[PDB]
Amino acid sequence: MVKVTYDGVYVLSVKEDVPAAGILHAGDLITEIDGQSFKSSQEFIDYIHSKKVGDTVKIKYKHGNKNEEASIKLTAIDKKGTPGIGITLVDDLEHHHHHH
Length: 100
Hints:
alpha+beta, Pdz3 Domain, 1 helix, 10% helix, globular, structural genomics, unknown function, PSI-2, Protein Structure Initiative, Northeast Structural Genomics Consortium
């Protein structure tokens, strides 16, 4: 009955000039954040977007074989002042365009 999971989200790149610098690195896999979830990797984008700038977050990720945990202060990345660090996650390249 042990439904152990093993499918996080891969990082495409890390801009070495953001709060994430020195904490997160490319190739790292995030497992959970603030215990909040809704589906897959997209679930995370919802959390960082559901909060506000100046807030705080707790990321659960493992670099290699060791489990590490770090928290970073939210900052504005996009023109719309969306809370979140400056990184890009992987989710099957493809054309990614349902309609919009």
